[PDB]
Design a protein around this ligand. Structure first.
Ligand SMILES: CCC(CC)O[C@@H]1C=C(C(=O)O)C[C@H](N)[C@H]1NC(C)=O
Ligand SMILES: CCC(CC)O[C@@H]1C=C(C(=O)O)C[C@H](N)[C@H]1NC(C)=O
Ligand SMILES: CCC(CC)O[C@@H]1C=C(C(=O)O)C[C@H](N)[C@H]1NC(C)=O
Ligand SMILES: CCC(CC)O[C@@H]1C=C(C(=O)O)C[C@H](N)[C@H]1NC(C)=O
Ligand SMILES: [Ca+2]
Ligand SMILES: [Ca+2]
Ligand SMILES: [Ca+2]
Ligand SMILES: [Ca+2]
Lengths: 387, 387, 387, 387
């Protein structure tokens, strides 16, 4: 076993639907399907895995409080990308109401944040063993990405932040080898005031990048750019007139560098670098509601160009309720790039609480200048009354 | 591990029943037995496995629609040849309403077709990772074999087809190494007009063959013959007076080359080459209803000779409801041939929806000019009211 | 991995209770505990395992017919020696209403007999793959040991029989390497007329032996003695005045060689050779009812001496319902002998059918001239009303 | 694999909560959560594992008697540190109403005591096979630690004791290589009269120590000190004014060497050596009721100095009901010390019987003169009525 190196993502032809997690089907069926939020997909030591926080409950008679963000019962669990949480493939990982995880080629690296709001704590596990920690520095909900960390020759990196969820939230970048924090970088830059829930992908041998959430009125996502060799990072707002966050106003042309938006709030969304020159991102179809999930791409520098990001397609039924989304990269055994998949959360709720389905698209086929998407249908009308 | 090489099947003495999948027993017991259709057996990396599509539901209170063929909830799953779908051995593979799978000696190759009818997509996974795709070319239900692909020195081949399920459905052959499509052959030949649900088996070091379904009035099965070295294929109709499809008229002598039949429809059926000079196949005992499954064999060229195939025996209670059937081959360390087993589907239905049991016969023992069959009994009278 | 060699069993000090399978507890609890008969323990590739035929049903609402011996739904399953059938550790093996199994050091060897009474068939699996078969020669319920086969340097051996269960039942011995029957021995000798359900243990580098059931009026168990080098076997009645079968009359002194007994019927019981000079056996405490299970030993030749076998102790509560019993041998990594354990079946029945618990004693501690037993208490009075 | 060598624990910065076992959550959810008592954590071959005795039952309808200590249905089981007993991770080990376990770097050693009160037996398993026994010597509930044994170069040691739970209970130390008892030491010393439920940890390359329970009025804990090379042990009472047992009177200065206490009873408690010169221990916050669990540390000889131990923090909500506590050590590839975690039991009861949750803290981060503790909250108000 060798450490995976950072490498570009594979370009391709079409985003196909590798699998979906139909949690809601098993909730309505009546099995012990667990309440999960916010699911995504991460490539781990066992292969591709669905990963999510959970609540140490399950249907058909779940306990109260499944809509809560943080609690003593919150959980980090993984299961098969075509399974459901609570089935045979389910693995419990750690205590957590915020998490990250990734696989460096030898072992799984895991961040588990829990504890009280005024002094929460990141516990780092490597190989199933607790190996290190990180302490709250703003004393106001230390928290992390809710998606994959990123790795290269034994160094994995992971964003954390801490601070008022309306005011400033000065983020930090951790660099971790065999579960030990070797370096902590404070992220400065014109898009650093409030950065959270970064979705990070390796872009090339020496660089990775993230698209984050700004929970302030700003609708332009902060972008974190990091370099492996120097272990350094910086943040800038996206300049493309295509606003990626939710809620947001209409797309419009504004001078680069500054924040833009009138609607407080935010949503975690995927960063999908394609090859060394292309940038894609997911955004909701609805400007205010978390409905739909469309893929937008440009070949230009989205930090420097107000040029709009073209729509490649609808990952999901555009009126279906969605939620978070993030990508992960999976090795391709016979060429120098990683397959990239994006997982979008499909939130639902009812008499059995808040919960989420998952859908996983992957970019496959020979490289194309402009790709297309297979739309995943989300239609619960034949069983929603049992949810 | 070495790549498995194509080799003839082992002759034997008797078809014995290796195991039952008694899905109906567990449905009536009350456990979370999943609704499955076309189930069959395939030799995978874990060993012999029962393989089927499912609906992301289970008893005792299944969701509506288990009878449907293609929905967004359809998935591909595998379990123990002697277990039941949903039990501890169950593994969820991918999103699929049509599938193929096989094991090349190093990894499982898996083909998962889903998406809309007018533009479905085959996603190809190898060793658990999505590696490639193939797009719809007739824009009318791209689909595939619902049984094993075949392999040799890292190359595995799989039939796909596309087009109206009554009109022309010109099929194609994929040749795949490590999950990457290396060659696509349009299959031509006098029996190639409408070809689907091919059941394929390695015949010899350089040959493999398939017996397919023609869904028109024609009751002679299309037979696909392929050569590994040239990666080349051809389709011809069977000629023997023993008509293999269901529905069919009486057996009768007719000139070779042309289709023949009076009732539209079809049924996936097993091709069972036995050694180098012997051909067997399965067919329903009933000419019109999917009831019973008898085994017919000949030592002649079924594509060139009208001779009746000799009924070897009844795999199953001949008035029992059956369904699809197909074979798979299992390595034998002792000699240079593979063991061959046939799986026959046993469809049932009731209060808990549409579903199926499975029975698995294997040819074992000293080679015999003519073999016998243990008839697996199918009698549900003691518990059918709970179905 | 090397093949295990035949070696003597380890002498010791006390029979301790390594574990029990409390099927009845989980039946009363209300989980999906499976109806099993007749359980025993066998050392397999995964370690010590509880092994039994089952019925493809489970509580809390089992289907009818769990008291049947042979049926299409009968099953061979294994699970953890301290588990229960149907729990997480359960493995389904094959179709079977009669079975054997053992582990040769590289792979598991398994015999699965099923099919109709007038022509049943043994299917042999090696390593999870069907490898060979054996055919009914008396056309009257081919059947086998229901306990471990025995192995040595790749040859495992297993008793089978066939014939009227009241009249003659001329048994045969199979010798099997990598799943292939290499030799079949017809067992002659003055105790061969009716031999079934042999319980076989390796005794020394070149010899194994079995204590069998004679279902005729005879209460003296047939003993099969076999030699590895010549692959040969012979049968003689036990001569000890201590009658080991059930039902049986009082112990009494009679001339060696002949049958003795007045009560038709029989029961499978354990053969426990201790070292190279000692012979133990289990028998019911009650002479007619299958209640209790006591261990009897002698250092003399039980085929040649009417000397009584001394009672070492009560494996189980002497008034508790028991059933079958048989031993299995487990390697001891640091000396030339195998630990021996005896598993006794504890049958129970009720509103949820016929079923069985299991208890496993093993002989541990430094060698003693006369050993002792820890009595396993069997008392269901706090939950039996839920059975 | 190499045998693990005895080595000091790692100092750190903060006790963080690695995971909850929320058995109560799953009992109230309605799944088959098993009733467990004294649960703790132990590093085994699989990794960190939650370990406990159980009753061969589970919710939602458990069988009577879950409150009992020693019955024929008691068994030893292990599961995920973040799962629940009975879930997918559950493993059944042996029959036991008292136990120990550890992993020597190659295999799990496991000690299982069961049998009648006046003659119980310790069965010793190594790597899954029964290897040895130890017999009752006081004929009054032979019993053991209910926590990890300790290992070094293939030798693992375990405390056992025997005798009235109020009168003298002279303990013994077993030294075991590959499951065979190599040495038994009668532990003498001024604190050796009544010694039970010792919680033992490797202290340095040649030393390990235990903090035990004295079930008389005495509230100073017996401390066992053992040397690996001589395989030699001794028992002395703790002297610090900080009384560790429960029930206890107020802390007060008293002369070293003698017992001291006013209330009969006792409670298993954790010994937590930290590096070479530091000692911590757990005790209830409440002096009489098993409520809360605070961590106390000193850098002095607790056996020779009256100095109070400094309260480091509350592991748990201090009015929450707790129970047993004990530590385990986890290898660290990065340096020459082991990580140390403490598991505190959280007993609950109700309609579904007696049961327990588990919380697991681990010392992580840069070494600190004095460490802090994340307080794991225990609040069941939202679901307790279902317990
Ligand atoms: C990091 C974003 C912010 C932290 C307070 O709120 C998030 C928004 C969420 C949301 O908008 O849906 C759900 C997240 N579970 C929550 N994170 C935490 C740690 O509570
Ligand atoms: C749509 C054509 C197709 C033949 C390949 O019909 C099949 C017939 C079936 C049948 O005759 O029972 C059931 C199959 N699930 C179905 N396959 C798909 C993909 O829907
Ligand atoms: C080999 C013994 C004889 C065979 C007819 O009866 C056995 C007696 C049994 C018994 O006495 O309890 C149960 C066994 N399941 C049965 N075996 C078969 C194959 O049916
Ligand atoms: C019988 C003495 C013994 C102390 C080692 O009492 C323990 C006290 C217990 C307790 O105080 O809660 C519960 C333990 N399960 C019990 N152990 C056994 C073996 O019964
Ligand atoms: Ca915003
Ligand atoms: Ca047809
Ligand atoms: Ca008899
Ligand atoms: Ca005390």
């Amino acid at each position: 076993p060798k450490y995976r190196m950072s490498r570009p993502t594979c370009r391709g032809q079409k985003w196909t639907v590798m699998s979906n997690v139909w949690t809601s089907r098993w909730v309505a069926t009546g099995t012990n399907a667990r309440n999960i939020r916010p699911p995504t997909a991460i490539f781990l030591k066992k292969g591709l895995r669905a990963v999510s926080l959970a609540h140490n409950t399950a249907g058909p008679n779940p306990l109260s409080g499944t809509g809560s963000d943080r609690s003593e019962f919150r959980d980090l669990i993984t299961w098969s990308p075509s399974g459901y949480p609570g089935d045979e493939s389910t693995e419990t990982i750690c205590k957590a109401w915020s998490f990250f995880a990734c696989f460096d080629g030898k072992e799984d690296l895991i961040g588990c944040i829990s504890g009280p709001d005024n002094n929460a704590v990141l516990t780092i596990m490597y190989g199933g063993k607790p190996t290190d920690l990180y302490n709250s520095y703003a004393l106001d909900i230390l928290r992390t990405m809710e998606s994959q960390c990123v790795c290269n020759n034994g160094t994995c990196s992971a964003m954390i932040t801490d601070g008022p969820d309306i005011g400033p939230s000065k983020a930090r970048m951790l660099f971790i080898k065999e579960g030990k924090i070797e370096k902590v970088v404070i992220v400065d830059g014109p898009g650093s005031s409030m950065v959270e829930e970064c979705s990070c992908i390796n872009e090339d041998s020496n660089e990775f990048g993230c698209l984050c959430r700004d929970n302030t009125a700003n609708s332009r996502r902060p972008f974190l750019k990091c370099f492996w060799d120097s272990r350094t990072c910086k943040a800038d707002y996206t300049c493309s007139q295509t606003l990626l966050d939710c809620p947001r106003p209409n797309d419009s042309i504004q001078t680069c560098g500054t924040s833009f938006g009138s609607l407080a709030g935010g949503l975690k969304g995927a960063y999908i670098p394609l090859g060394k020159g292309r940038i894609c991102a997911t955004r909701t179809v609805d400007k205010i509601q978390r409905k739909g999930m469309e893929l937008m791409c440009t070949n230009g520098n989205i930090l420097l160009e107000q040029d709009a990001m073209k729509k490649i397609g609808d990952l999901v039924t555009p009126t279906a309720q969605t939620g978070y989304s993030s990508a992960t990269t999976i090795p391709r055994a016979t060429e120098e790039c990683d397959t990239i998949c994006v997982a979008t959360e499909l939130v639902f709720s009812g008499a059995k609480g808040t919960n989420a389905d998952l859908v996983i698209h992957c970019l496959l086929g020979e490289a194309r200048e402009t790709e297309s998407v297979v739309t995943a249908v989300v239609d619960r009308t034949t069983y929603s009354s049992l949810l």
